[PDB]
Design a protein around this ligand. Structure first.
Ligand SMILES: */C=C/C(=O)Nc1ccc(/C=C/c2nc(Nc3cc(C)[nH]n3)cc(N3CCN(C)CC3)n2)cc1
Length: 291
C-alpha cells in the first residue's frame, strides 16, 4: 500500500531536479540530480546528488529491496568509508532514495581505466594499499553495527572526487540476527564468485563470511579490476573451492598482502581474521610504505 512517514529523512519533491541517468539495468536505475537545501545549514544551495529509483518494469521485490536498502542506511549510521544517505521522497509519488554523488564511479571501472598503457594516471602501490585500508575501516565499522553486507565487491564500491572509497549497494545487507539460518532458500541471490563456502553449503552468514568477500575484493584491487577465477565458470567453482583451490598471487602485490587474502579465504570461518585485525595489519603496512 504505502510507506510510513519518516520526517527525519523526508526531502520535499519540488526541491529535487532529476538529471541524466548514471546507469540503468536490473534492480533499479540511478540518476544525477540537484537537491536544493539538502544540507540544512545551507537552505538555498543546490547540491549534486545521486537518486536511486525504480524503472518501468520494476517488480514487487525490486520495490521491497529499495525500501530495504533505505531502511538499512538509516540504521547503520555514518562513516567516511560508507556512502552517505542524504534523504528520501517516500510520499505521494515514486520512491526516490537520495545519496551523496561519488564523481568517479564504481571501483572496478575506476581501476581498469588506470591500468598501465597496453582519470588515466597509473595507480601506485601505496594507492592500492590505501584503498584497501579505507575499505577495511568501512567494513570494521559495519561489523561493529551488527550489519553484514553480503555483496562486497569492486563494482559495489564508489569513488569520490578526492578518491575516497565508499562501500555502497546495501540491497542485500542484513542485521546479523535477520538471517533465516539453515533454510534452503537463504543466500540465493549472492554472486557466487564473492561468496563464502559456508553461505552456500550451510546456509548461514556471519561477519566471517564478509571477510571472505573482502579477500576477493582485495584480489580485485591488486589486479586493477580483474575478474575472479579467470575462466572458471560459476557452475564448477564450488567443487573447486571445496577441494582447496584459491586464486594465485597478483603481480602488483607483495607476498604479505597475498597472505592476507589467503587468510581471508581460510576454509574454517573462525580461522579467518576479523575486520578489526585486518585494519591493524593494513595500518602497519600502509604506515611503512609511506615512510
Ligand atoms: C544490473 C546492471 C546495472 O544496473 N548496472 C549499473 C548500476 C548502477 C550504475 C550507476 C553507476 C555510477 N554511479 C555513480 N555515482 C554514484 C552512485 C551513487 C549511489 N552515488 N554516486 C557514478 C557513475 N559514473 C561516474 C563516472 N563515469 C565516468 C561513469 C559513471 N556511475 C551503473 C551500472
Amino acid at each position: 500500500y504505502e510507506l510510513p512517514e519518516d520526517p527525519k529523512w523526508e526531502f520535499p519533491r519540488d526541491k529535487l531536479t532529476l538529471g541524466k541517468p548514471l546507469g540503468e539495468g536490473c534492480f533499479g536505475q540511478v540518476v544525477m540530480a540537484e537537491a536544493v537545501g539538502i544540507d540544512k545549514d545551507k537552505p538555498k544551495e543546490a547540491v549534486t546528488v545521486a537518486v536511486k529509483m525504480l524503472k518501468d518494469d520494476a517488480t514487487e521485490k525490486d520495490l521491497s529491496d529499495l525500501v530495504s536498502e533505505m531502511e538499512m542506511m538509516k540504521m547503520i549510521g555514518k562513516h567516511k568509508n560508507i556512502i552517505n544517505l542524504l534523504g528520501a521522497c517516500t510520499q505521494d509519488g515514486p520512491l526516490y532514495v537520495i545519496f551523496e554523488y561519488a564523481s568517479k564511479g564504481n571501483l572496478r571501472e575506476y581501476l581498469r581505466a588506470r591500468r598501465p598503457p597496453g582519470p588515466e594516471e597509473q595507480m601506485t602501490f601505496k594507492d592500492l594499499v590505501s584503498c584497501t585500508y579505507q575499505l577495511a575501516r568501512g567494513m570494521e565499522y559495519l561489523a561493529s553495527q551488527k550489519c553484514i553486507h553480503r555483496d562486497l565487491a569492486a563494482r559495489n564500491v564508489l569513488v569520490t572526487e578526492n578518491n575516497v572509497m565508499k562501500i555502497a549497494d546495501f540491497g542485500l545487507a542484513r542485521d546479523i540476527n535477520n538471517i533465516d539460518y539453515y533454510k534452503k532458500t537463504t543466500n540465493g541471490r549472492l554472486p557466487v564468485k564473492w561468496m563464502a563456502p559456508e553461505a552456500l553449503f550451510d546456509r548461514v552468514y556471519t561477519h566471517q563470511s564478509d571477510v571472505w568477500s573482502f579477500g576477493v575484493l582485495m584480489w580485485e584491487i591488486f589486479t586493477l579490476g580483474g575478474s575472479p577465477y579467470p575462466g572458471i565458470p560459476v557452475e564448477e567453482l564450488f567443487k573447486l573451492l571445496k577441494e582447496g583451490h584459491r586464486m594465485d598471487k597478483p603481480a602488483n602485490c607483495t607476498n604479505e598482502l597475498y597472505m592476507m587474502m589467503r587468510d581471508c579465504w581460510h576454509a574454517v570461518p573462525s580461522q579467518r581474521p576479523t575486520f578489526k585485525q585486518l585494519v591493524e595489519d593494513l595500518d602497519r603496512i600502509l604506515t611503512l610504505t609511506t615512510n
